[PDB]
Structure 1
Amino acid sequence: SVEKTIRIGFVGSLLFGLLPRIIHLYRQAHPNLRIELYEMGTKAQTEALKEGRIDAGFGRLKISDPAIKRTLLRNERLMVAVHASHPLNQMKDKGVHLNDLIDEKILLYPSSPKPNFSTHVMNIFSDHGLEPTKINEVREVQLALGLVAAGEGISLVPASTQSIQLFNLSYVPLLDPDAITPIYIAVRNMEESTYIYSLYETIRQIYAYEGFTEPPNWLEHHHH
């Protein structure tokens, strides 16, 4: 039965955060439902939603398209991943600011088409008249972390990346209040299905276990 299927797209690195918990609870509440999961970048999720290849997309930025709509789930703090012997690691307990990083070799990611996660990272530098002088782009966050640990530079990464711990890799807090990164759930620009409204309530439940406080105008409910 094609009607009893829900297909979900997601950026791969979100598996380091709350997404697996959400999927686990969703499956527990829906043993009847065939749930299919597809890794894809935020840009690619738009075309997949428009074409009906997926029904909801977990992404890391807003890319405006009239066929799609979205809800901001939350913002994650950014950390600076450094080698433990880097001078910046002496500020591990308290943190650093974006302006401390301008002359460092920074590893951006992913390498998938623009805009992507790295676009916002470069924007927050520009927003404050900061011009990083040494940038390299790598394939994905786990490669960036391994390179940092090998001595290749530093990288700005979501806080949930701390699920990965490597010898002599250290995560330093980034103190600028706008040094954060968004998580969105995107769907077709139409009324959500029963199954998608059910996914929204699963997210609400997981976020409540995590102690987050939701605004009034957050995830929409079904109306008459």
Structure 2
Amino acid sequence: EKTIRIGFVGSLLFGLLPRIIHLYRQAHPNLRIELYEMGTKAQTEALKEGRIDAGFGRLKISDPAIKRTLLRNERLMVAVHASHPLNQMKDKGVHLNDLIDEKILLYPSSPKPNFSTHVMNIFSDHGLEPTKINEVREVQLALGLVAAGEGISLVPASTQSIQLFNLSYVPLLDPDAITPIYIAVRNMEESTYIYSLYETIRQIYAYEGFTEPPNWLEHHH
């Protein structure tokens, strides 16, 4: 009967999204939940046209008809082969500057902007421009190729959900080597169904010891 539609970006499935959806589901055994993989652009259009009710994404939205909230900044990490000299630093962590001359694997090859433009922006923003750059189709290809000895990759920290033989994840010491997670809704959105979804996020975050996201409708208050 009652339907809630949620747009999301693929990479978030490695993060807290599934847990959040599943807990949410329990709060509303009545509710039909439709999930759609879509980019930030498609999310913006859908939200405005009423085709989704909340969008989870990694890019900022330039549209007054949409209210967007930063949930958390996810740390970036470097995926490396176990035998890479950089892995000698797994416990300590490394700096973006240490990577400029490495063969770097970007992904995905979907339309842009995407995570590959994000990574390049992170570098750019730190005054860095890697030349040994190779764009690969999807996350599992980047990781597989890294494990194969083809180079290194920058990944969100939750990518550690994937463990491959001889694949290692090195922390980045740069404060701003991050990838943001946003919720986006219709500017005038007031529904308790969305409130509940947002409260579920707050609950999970508290369990995990993350900074709690802003209070519901703080542009109102």
Please tell me the TM-score bracket, short chain as reference.
Answer: over 0.9
Structure 1 residue 41, shift from structure 2 partner = 2.2
Render the CA deviation track for 1:48-79: whole Å, top value 9, x for unaligned: 21222211111012131222221100011100
What is the alpha-carbon distance in structure 1 between the residues aligned to residue 40 and residue 18 of structure 2?
Answer: 18
Q: State the Cα distance separating 1:218 from its structure 2 match.
A: 6.7
Contact 2:195/2:216, CA 8 A, preserved across alignment: no
Out of 83, 88, 104, the position equivalent to 1:85 is: 83
* Residues 32-54 of structure 1: per-residue CA shift (max 9 Å, x gap): 01011111222321122122221
- What residue is the counterpart of 1:18 in the other structure? 16
* Contact 2:5/2:51 (8 A) holds in 1: yes
Q: Which deviates the most, 123-132 or 153-162?
A: 123-132
Conservation of the 8 A alpha-carbon contact between 1:71 and 1:219: no
**Normalised by the size of structure 1, how large is the TM-score?**
0.92
Q: Deviations over 1:110-165 (max 9, x none)?
A: 22222212222211211222110111112221221111111111110000000100
Q: Given the alignment of the two structures, is residue 61 of structure 1 paired with residue 66 of structure 2, yes or no? A: no
Does the 8 Å CA contact 2:202/2:213 hold for their aligned counterparts? Answer: no
Q: Is the 8 A contact 1:78 1:159 kept in 2?
A: yes
1:112 counterpart SS class: coil
Q: 2-side partners of 1:198 and 1:217: how far apart?
A: 12
The residue aligned with 2:156 is: 158
CA contact (8 A) 1:96 1:173 kept: yes
CA displacement at 1:217 relative to structure 2 = 5.3
User: RMSD of the TM alignment (CA)?
Assistant: 1.9
Check 1:36–1:120 CA distance in 2 against 1; reply closer, same or farther (3 A cut): same
Is 1:61–1:182's contact at 8 Å kept on the other side of the alignment? yes
Distance 1:4 1:46 in 2: 22
Q: Deviations over 1:198-223 (max 9, x none)?
A: 11111111111111122655765x98
SS of aligned partner of 1:148: helix
**Percent of aligned pairs with the same residue?**
100
Change (3 A) 1:144 1:217: same
Contact 1:41/1:112 (8 A) holds in 2: no
| 2:18 alignment partner, SS class | helix
Report if aligned partners of 2:15, 2:158 keep a CA contact under 8 Å in 1: yes
- Structure 1's 159 and 219: CA in aligned 2 closer, same or farther, altered over 3 A? farther
Structure 1 residue 101: Cα displacement:
0.4
CA spacing shift, 1:218–1:52, aligned 2, 3 Å = closer
171, 174, 178: which one aligns with 2:172 = 174
CA contact (8 A) 1:43 1:116 kept: no
CA drift at 1:29:
0.4
1:84 CA drift (Å): 0.7
Q: Equivalents in 1 of 2:94, 2:216: separation in Å?
A: 32
**Structure 1: which 4+ aligned runs deviate by more than 6 Å?**
none
Q: Distance in 1 between matches of 2:212 and 2:141?
A: 34
Q: Is the 8 A contact 2:72 2:213 kept in 1?
A: no
Residue 216 to residue 69, structure 1, CA distance change in 2 (3 Å):
closer
Q: 1:153 to 1:20 in 2, by over 3 A?
A: same
